[model samples]
Target: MASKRALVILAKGAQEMETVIPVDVMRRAGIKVTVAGLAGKDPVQCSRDVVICPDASLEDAKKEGPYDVVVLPGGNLGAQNLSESAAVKEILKEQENRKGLIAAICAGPTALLAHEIGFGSKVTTHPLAKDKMMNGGHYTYSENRVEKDGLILTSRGPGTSFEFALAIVEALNGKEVAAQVKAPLVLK
Candidate 1:
């Protein structure tokens, strides 16, 4: 089997925990992960004051993508930032064109609307983000902690990050790998 890779697009004002958990969990599953800064190569200040330096610029990292999955981590401004990026829209279009997995959490799913990526699938987002997510009525809303409909997977808020990550692991690797990876996390 070929090595699996994942690309995580991190915008300024992103949720640090939501961004870190999935990237860490996927790395733990042996998937090569790329942390791409949305705008440029520099340190990003996340929503709650934590900071992160991305592996590369989104423009640069995208050249290395066609990853097994592309992940979006959310904060209100982060999603808004993501929503405005033509590059992000193209990256998502490319990923969907390849029938690859696209995962978003919290306000992250709101980015889907900006890209017009998945329509008709049930998804969830932060409760406060519901109005934006439900805009145009293109997609149905679900309260599921993790909602996987074909290639698009979504979850609600920072609280569901681990579950969201494990679901991505399961999709890219397998149930066994996800379970094996889950065991050490000692999560409930």
Candidate 2:
């Protein structure tokens, strides 16, 4: 089949640009993505005040099996919401156990730490979140826009969302498809 699925969790105060850009670009690269809400299947007001209605509640979305990756978009509050989720933690654990990709951007990497997911890969997060993400010096660090070392992928912030998403596409699909998808984004 020409499809790999993805789950993107949406929480209150999430960075909408971080969330939306990847969802849009993943679809562009032919990944079937489900945007699931942290609370319920309703409109969530994001950090910069954009509203999005997720495809399902995380509770409901959890029933959907085996996405190629689980995406976490960050804002401090959003990351906290995700970090505090037992469901998110369980899923992250399962994804890790199965060796699936877990992609987080900006403060989203903190969620991985909260769940104890990425201890080996060198990760990058928004500079402001670096301390919290260090997991007491467990995981290594990177200053790059996007960092993908094995099953964990991370990127910095809204400014790097496209690179983050394209890196995701390259990981899930392939470099050629990511290039095809990136060609028309007209990124500078």
Candidate 3:
């Protein structure tokens, strides 16, 4: 079988931890992962001043995709950029229509809310982003560190990123693969 693929959309001001943890964990799980820059093929300056150079531009990545999972990393500005992006909206909507997994963390779920991709699914977000995700009452909200409702998966802030990534790994590869991957990390 072909390896599962994941696309993590990166925008300026994105949370570096949320952006990197899943990409690293999914790759370790033998999943093919792409870090796509939203604004183009340039290094993005993250919320805490960390910079990341994306592997592909979102336009380029979109063409190669039908990815098993589409990931969104959160930072207030980053999520806002995602929320305002037409390309992100298209990718997310297509992923949803195909029943593929869509994972968002921290403020990232707000972007899902912005794109109208997963209404009525139970979701979670950073405490600070709850009001934004709840706007219009489109979805049920949770405070879980990680929450999954069908294809939509949501997690809280940076502290929960490892759990979020492992959940994604489990979702795509199976419980065994997720466990094997987690063991080496020595997470308690």
Candidate 4:
């Protein structure tokens, strides 16, 4: 079987746990995860004091996407930086056009508002961005650990990163693999 591909876009100061935890969980579920940084060579720092070297730069990954899934983890500086990247915007636009899955957690969903993609889709983010998403025409807020709307999935923050990752795994794979991952966490 071909492995499912997932790209996690990162910028200068992305939230470390949001990106890392998901990568770990997804990899455990047999997903191929790549961390794509906006700037080609520079290492991105995380909120929790971790630095990550991206698998590829945004420019390189932008035209390369059509992947099974794309993820955006949130941090004030990281989301801000990613929102400003043309590569990230273009990749997201393509993902939406293809009806592919796009996951965003915390303030990461706010970045979608700037691109007009998350509108009218049920989504959840950090409480601070809830009103923002609502005002932008998001259908509803689950307020649960993870929320799925068609091909998109979202979570609140670091607290729910594993559940969020498992949610994506379920969305792409199936209940068996998702449940396998979830069982260990006592999520079932």
lDDT leaderboard ranking: 3, 2, 1, 4
User: Is 2 or 4 the stronger prediction by lDDT?
Assistant: 2
For all predicted structures, in order, the TM-scores are 0.98, 0.98, 0.99, 0.91
Question: How would you order the candidates by TM-score, starting with the best?
Answer: 3, 1, 2, 4
Candidate 1 per-residue C-alpha lDDT over 45-89 given as tens digits, one digit per residue, 9 for 90 to 100: 999989999999999998887899999999998889999999999
Name the 10 consecutive residues with the lowest summed lDDT in model 1: 118-127
Where does model 3 exceed 4 Å of error? none
lDDT of 3 by residue, 1-188 (tens): 89999999999989999999999999999999999999999999999999999999999999998999999999999999999999999999999999999999999999998899989999999999999999899999997899999999999999999999999999999999999999989887
Please state the error at residue 55 of candidate 3 in Å.
0.3
lDDT of the candidates, in the order given: 0.94, 0.94, 0.97, 0.83
Model 1 / residue 50 / CA error / Å: 0.5
Q: List the residue pairs that clash in candidate 1.
A: none
Better-scoring candidate (TM-score), 3 or 4: 3
* Top of the candidates by TM-score: 3
State residue 6's C-alpha deviation in candidate 2, in Å: 0.5
Model 2 stretches with alpha carbons more than 4 Å out:
none
